[PDB]
């Protein structure tokens, strides 16, 4: 009965993982094995996608989420995002899957055979939740390992082949970054942008130079915080402000993760730079803008003067002004005029869309992309009928962008709930009333009446 | 074909309940 | 307390139970299968098969339009299918 | 060696499949901590070896 | 002690008639601003060009509405997701025309209500209570975030957030069904089970506890006077309510642990409303309800309509009429 | 009475429903009602 | 497609990603074994 | 001991499933409502009554299967199997919609039997029958929606069909033709159902988070004995919490649980009243004063006029297929449509 | 010492056996082509 039942451990079967709070070695097995499932999934899924991949179809017509992540890093892909070598995907898939087995082995070892607790086997790996020095030291190691990983991405971009760059001339291409952005006025300017329309906070990052540069800063920032915490101990003010318990630290990370999942959700929905529409399909704003373009193009070929066409409302049918006066596409898409994409920016002048470039300079590759993107708008049904909700069956499509944004909204939400659950409980448990109110000293009974 | 898949998942999935079964026989440490 | 009967946990772990129900359950299942595979369900309940919704060239629906002539109305639509 | 590659790759699968059921039963049976230490250790090297062997073969048929 | 400590002690006093608390310090001003603006706009605000087409909708009582038709109208589609504080307008008159009060009300209200939730945690800590009431409230709060923030984000405009009015709410629901077939979404079906089941279990628990009140009063006084506030003992016979309900269905379909029973009452509506809030939040990203349109076809290929096709004809009627002047191109992609 | 451990019947029963349900989801894509 | 070498492994590759969910189910088979102690 | 008293004894035996006198009405009628629903959603069509498939057999899924109402041409016929329409022909009964009346009417008598069951068990066990009283609200809903509403209409056709998407169809019909959302009796029912869900959640959470510590474990469920005398949670601390969070709080446990019965039961009753109104097309459809203004002032627009335009779209786009017996033919050019869509 | 046939017994079989039979019915339907 080494903990492991509700009598000794005080936790019922349905909260049995709380039995591991003060068993550091069994807890280490749970984590490592869990990491095993994560790495397993990255491996198994990528191979699933490969066996199901047909390089003639757009990636976004084939239900793919992981391969687009590999393509964006510059493997397997060429100009326009055309897939030119699938072998790199196979490699990512197999290496993660092999690797899961050793995580697997290590976790199941530590969870069963290994010492249930570590603190008597080596004073270095064992820990007490309440050791503020040991806790910051672990934090500091992991901080350094994250800084390293951020710099792995810089290495790929600058020294090991580059990244897919949707803004690259000739419709996109892989490309080495040689002038990362280091000006902190740019790098940290992003953090001070409003998250509101037209600004978009850090989701608006729209070039690989800013992306690589920011990862230099973050890598060096993490490595330096790692050292900081490894050498320091929390100060007076911080000691008094936090709960120091294993559950409390759990609640803090559920906090972080939730906020991150929400940010992820908006990244994949709005950003067409690190989520290239070549691989992920068009953004919602992008498809909507693309439709206005398509019908501008068509009607202009028929002889319409699209700049002077007054629509029914009195607003232009194809073109109107944004509230700060920029020329923008008309109709409902007036909400999406903040959209920027490589297929559309060539028509842009200083005052917005440029009617002379509209009359003269639209190439067939733009008509193609705009038509492609309008008909791959991220709308579809749970059972993958593509289109608006009134559409008939025929098209088997739901945008990767919808799949990724919905999943991670749901995940971020429940993780905020977990934060509240475990933070509240941690506070309760630190003060000693998580199990209920003491009949013998019920606090309210000692308070004056409100009236 | 699809029996290829079904024989794999058949085998993979019963793999789990078995480990429990063996460790039970062996008065293992469940 | 107990209203008297044999506890369930007791019956379904019993061998005699599964002796009896290793047979009856799959048999019932196959009975249902056959009910559809024999095409019997179609004729019992009057449910169209995929080829008997419309006559080959019609696009209108055999909607019943009379209360007491109604049994005759359905039977005459089932003539025009052949 | 179009056939010696599958010989190794099925070795991986048939071995993986063994050690997947075998390592956790081994670990939680009290009897044979010592009757099995060797077992898992040998399959382990056998597994790793196989991954490598299959890893180099690939480059003559892929 | 010193001044900042007197203040801290007042803010967190468990003796104020209404608890303030640190969350209250943000909640009070933000709710006050949202409430005052909403009351004034509802009565007096002039018409608002919600869809950005210079076609203003009158939402206020003084401009010809009643309690049922009136609303604070969402901000203009021309604005999309841009921040439109009063100081960004060239005049209050411009701000009213483009629907600014709506932004002000909902931002202050989401903030205020997010802090209302924190306040529920905060007081439960000062009282020595367990902390998860605030978790229950996360279900309604999450739902408000969905219709006022998340759905506008996915669709790219606050003009498609929920209006602050009785009829405006209906407008939003009809357009939603048209564009997402929400009726056919399992998360919304889970929401209906949540609230139906909540109403059911609500009537059941009340009926069942009321059924087993201990005779502690006469026929001429209210039964309620048989319970005295703070009494040590319980005033109903839970064993008798189990004896009734266990026989109504069967003995183990009935709860005899008061704690298990009340946990169930908490979890059923909260979980279901979590799902329907997540349903609006994911339909915000156009992952829509099941689509079974022309799913049954016959041996030749004729479409054999189902009830799903009949729903689709209603949806299409909503689709083609809504915002009747706002679309110039054949697809309504957001 | 009690010759077969409850956990075994549970797993068996469970895997049995997973199959039938799995089959119905397959049917949504094949044959009648698949839109094809 | 995978490299044609690994083609015979296609239906195993088909089922592998569902494997992590079996782990969650395996934990319940396990607690049924120990009777949810 | 008379034979009546011996039958009474056996019917009121303490067994795993209590029977009773009410059982003689309840178990047969409930089994047959259920069984006829399962049978019809599994095997029976709606082709001759509606122009629709409605069974698994035809390839419907659990959302789109229904036992559909009988054709409009049947009026309000009981559609007895031995009646003049089907003339004892079971197969033709199914095809004309007999299962709909079969389910509807056995279900009605089964709900009767259930309520009498609630009365019968309350009397034997010795408790007040407030649960049976609560069950009047489901009964009023069922009677009003499934029986009264179609009896006011042209036929059973326009009652609800027994299926998930069929009911969704009914919701949207009621919006487009009755403007049911605008109806104060529905508005009240909404308040009662959402208010009951609120009461359900807040009472559960309040109890769970004011428990006294009565055991020493972290799972608090094991610290309760149904035979204990003591309240398992603190009314006093619960009361203070909500007084300072929300301004007022409950102080009386009996009032609180009576209020929990009242709110949802009263909401469903109010909704039933409005549907009785709609049995007669006595709708709250319009606000005359808005229509007078709007007809005169083409710049006047509210959310009320916007919603009617949607209603108008629903009626015209859905009626031809929804009411096939009318042979509505609407050329493209009469269909109401906004610009572009 | 228990009975085996009871009212309860009848209750479970009035449900269970039509349920199994329906399940095989439905299973077969998955293989109907048009
Ligand atoms: C503890 C912390 C407490 C903090 C409180 C104070 C925070 C206030 C912030 C308010 C956030 C709400 C407004 C978000 C609205 C919005 O436009 O947010 C979206 C913005 C992205 O903005 C978009 O970003 C775009 C960037 O794309 C541009 O650049 C791209 C470059 O590739 C493309 O080219 C694209 O075409 C081009 O437009 C444009 O700027 C768009 O116009 C702009 O709208 O996201 C973002 O900043 C990322 C984060 C969005 C917020 C996260 C959602 C939170 C959900 C709440 C959950 C409720 C929980 C339940 C409670 C119970
Ligand atoms: C509460 C808890 C209670 C528990 C409920 C227990 C459930 C009991 C089961 C209910 C039985 C309902 C059967 C109702 C049958 C019915 O009505 O069937 C309808 C028939 C009338 O038949 C209809 O008659 C109509 C009018 O016809 C008449 O009008 C025509 C002129 O155009 C011609 O002249 C025609 O020949 C002539 O008959 C049309 O013909 C319809 O097609 C035909 O169905 O009446 C009849 O059976 C009888 C009518 C006499 C009144 C019967 C009382 C019940 C009806 C309640 C009505 C109140 C609600 C009204 C709201 C509106
Ligand atoms: C996973 C990352 C992580 C985590 C969990 C921690 C955790 C901790 N840090 Mg460490 N730290 C990290 C990374 C991290 N750090 C890195 C990378 C650096 C180098 C940049 C540091 C540098 C650092 C210093 C210098 C100190 C800590 C301290 C602490 C402790 C107090 C934290 C605190 O009060 O939070 C924040 C809580 C607050 C109440 C701060 C309030 C200020 C506002 C509300 C937050 C926003 C401020 C932010 C800087 C700007 C916002 C940007 C905006 C545009 C979005 C805690 C153990 C403190 C300590 O005791 O050190 C020994 C301390 O003084 N950390
Ligand atoms: C990511 C999922 C996850 C992980 C990693 C863990 C991990 C752990 N749990 Mg938790 N748990 C989970 C989900 C999880 N659980 C869920 C969903 C439930 C609810 C049903 C529980 C309920 C629960 C309870 C009630 C208890 C635990 C306990 C434990 C610990 C001891 C395990 C033990 O004694 O098993 C013994 C079981 C066996 C030996 C049977 C075999 C198990 C092995 C690991 C199978 C591995 C299969 C795999 C395919 C191996 C081959 C691959 C290899 C070649 C690499 C362990 C660290 C226990 C604890 O806290 O200990 C004090 C405890 O009492 N957990
Ligand atoms: C964030 C995680 C995430 C995301 C975004 C996706 C997204 C996708 N997957 Mg992947 N997948 C995941 C996790 C994820 N999956 C995991 C954990 C597994 C292992 C079980 C798989 C296994 C997997 C396979 C085997 C396949 C996909 C496929 C797909 C595509 C179609 C999905 C579909 O029809 O859903 C159907 C939707 C549901 C079943 C609803 C599930 C939601 C549950 C019931 C409720 C939410 C639960 C919880 C609270 C959250 C889509 C691109 C398919 C594809 O197109 O391949 C190319 C495919 O065949 N995925
Ligand atoms: C978070 C990971 C983690 C941690 C902190 C520990 C910690 C511990 N383990 Mg475990 N273990 C792990 C993972 C982990 N293990 C994994 C994955 C496996 C399977 C491969 C094992 C298998 C295992 C066994 C079988 C045993 C231990 C033992 C021990 C103890 C001594 C180990 C030691 O000092 O090695 C010495 C350390 C070194 C020689 C340094 C080299 C370590 C590696 C090679 C460096 C590579 C790091 C890599 C770059 C990081 C990237 C990973 C990934 C992102 C690619 C200690 C408590 C022993 C024990 O508990 O005593 C009975 C024991 O018998 N572990
Ligand atoms: C809680 C949520 C409720 C679901 C119940 C969960 C049961 C799970 C439970 O808590 O305990 C399970 C309970 C215990 O049975 P035994 O005492 O046989 O088992 C003892 C074992 O638990 C020892 O391990 O068995 C049931 O009651 C089986 C139910 C089948 C009932 C057959 C019903 C058919 C009759 C028709 C329905 C009634 C008619 C109503 C009026 C018309
Ligand atoms: C602790 C515990 C648990 C958990 C567990 C875990 C979580 C585990 C993990 C595990 C793992 C994590 C494992 C892994 C595995 C792996 C493997 C075994 C792999 C292998 C691989 C291979 C063999 C490969 C092959 C291939 C190739 C190479 C190519 C292509 C084809 C193929 C794919 C076939 C539970 C809850 C139950 C209970 C309690 C305790
Ligand atoms: C990479 C990249 C980049 C960059 C980035 C960066 C640079 C970052 C930063 C970051 C950051 C820098 C962040 C921050 C954070 C913060 C936070 C999030 C905070 C929080 C806090 C809290 C949580 C607190 C709380 C409290 C209080 C207030 C009082 C007492 C109690 C407590 C303590 C609880 C960019 C965009 C350019 C581009 C792309 C890529
Ligand atoms: C990668 C790979 C591999 C590996 C694999 C593995 C890693 C496996 C695992 C597996 C697993 C991991 C399994 C598991 C299983 C599970 C199961 C099958 C479960 C189920 C369950 C059930 C059915 C349930 C039931 C119940 C109970 C018991 C209690 C309560 C109630 C309920 C109903 C829930 C191999 C070698 C093939 C090679 C190739 C590749
Ligand atoms: C009508 C009629 C009648 C009667 C009949 C009857 C009595 C029937 C029965 C029937 C029955 C009584 C049937 C049943 C069936 C059932 C079923 C069909 C079930 C199924 C289910 C399922 C499929 C489920 C499953 C699941 C899910 C889905 C999810 C969750 C989990 C579970 C596993 C639960 C007579 C003779 C008078 C003649 C005339 C007419
Ligand atoms: O649904 Mn239809 O879609 Ca979402 O936008 Mn396009 O039209 Mn308009 O402004 Mn409100 O509403
Ligand atoms: Cl509208
Ligand atoms: Cl448009
Ligand atoms: Fe209660």
mmCIF file of C-alpha atoms in Angstrom, chain I residues 10-33:
data_model
loop_
_atom_site.group_PDB
_atom_site.id
_atom_site.type_symbol
_atom_site.label_atom_id
_atom_site.label_comp_id
_atom_site.label_asym_id
_atom_site.label_seq_id
_atom_site.Cartn_x
_atom_site.Cartn_y
_atom_site.Cartn_z
ATOM 1 C CA UNK I 10 -38.785 -9.646 -17.029
ATOM 2 C CA UNK I 11 -37.977 -5.937 -16.959
ATOM 3 C CA UNK I 12 -34.406 -6.390 -18.183
ATOM 4 C CA UNK I 13 -35.319 -8.854 -20.926
ATOM 5 C CA UNK I 14 -38.186 -6.789 -22.323
ATOM 6 C CA UNK I 15 -35.479 -4.225 -23.045
ATOM 7 C CA UNK I 16 -32.248 -6.123 -23.653
ATOM 8 C CA UNK I 17 -33.402 -8.662 -26.208
ATOM 9 C CA UNK I 18 -35.097 -6.194 -28.583
ATOM 10 C CA UNK I 19 -32.007 -4.023 -28.152
ATOM 11 C CA UNK I 20 -29.557 -6.696 -29.301
ATOM 12 C CA UNK I 21 -31.808 -7.650 -32.198
ATOM 13 C CA UNK I 22 -32.054 -4.021 -33.242
ATOM 14 C CA UNK I 23 -28.259 -3.681 -33.068
ATOM 15 C CA UNK I 24 -27.735 -6.490 -35.584
ATOM 16 C CA UNK I 25 -30.426 -5.008 -37.778
ATOM 17 C CA UNK I 26 -28.568 -1.688 -37.730
ATOM 18 C CA UNK I 27 -25.160 -3.342 -38.201
ATOM 19 C CA UNK I 28 -26.374 -4.945 -41.428
ATOM 20 C CA UNK I 29 -27.635 -1.591 -42.669
ATOM 21 C CA UNK I 30 -24.055 -0.239 -42.768
ATOM 22 C CA UNK I 31 -23.374 -2.543 -45.742
ATOM 23 C CA UNK I 32 -26.377 -1.586 -47.866
ATOM 24 C CA UNK I 33 -25.207 0.127 -51.039
#
